[PDB]
Design a protein around this ligand. Structure first.
Ligand code: HEM
Length: 123
């Protein structure tokens, strides 16, 4: 069920999260959304998105998603391109840690799932 289990333990999860966080930090398309976010929240956010994309959506009610990103949408110009960039960053991270291509496509399908995307984007 858990992220822990699907990736195979604490060290695997830590690797995924740290590499994903590193990549987002360096991605000029989306870095400025985290401008007013301390680095603890920044890393927690990537662990959240990662948790979501591996099928732990349970914690990410669309109504919570809609409120949590409202200021990004209204004041930072958050849009589809940004949303897609975060998913692409995740799939690039997993590939570089040798996650099977069929498993990457599985997480691609959850990461880019339409109803959660509409909620985050306040559409
Ligand atoms: C389904 C996709 C995503 C999920 C599941 C997700 C989840 C979360 C969660 C749980 C929070 C709330 C944290 C809290 O209450 O303190 C949050 C906050 C935030 N998310 Fe997302 N998010 C998603 C997509 C995005 C995208 C596309 C961006 C930026 C390009 C983004 C940027 C942020 C920002 C800046 C915050 C506020 C700061 C923070 O708490 O890190 N999120 N996100």
């Amino acid at each position: 069920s858990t992220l822990y289990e699907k990736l195979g333990g604490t060290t695997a999860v830590d690797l995924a999260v740290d590499k994903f966080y590193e990549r987002v930090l360096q991605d000029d398309r989306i870095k400025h959304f985290f401008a007013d976010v301390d680095m603890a929240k920044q890393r927690a956010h990537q662990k959240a998105f990662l948790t979501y994309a591996f099928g732990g959506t349970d914690k990410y009610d669309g109504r919570y998603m809609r409120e949590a990103h409202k200021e990004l949408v209204e004041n930072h110009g958050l849009n589809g391109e940004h949303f897609d960039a975060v998913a692409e960053d995740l799939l690039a991270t997993l590939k570089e840690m040798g996650v099977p291509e069929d498993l990457i496509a599985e997480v691609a399908a959850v990461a880019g799932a339409p109803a959660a995307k509409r909620d985050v984007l306040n559409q």
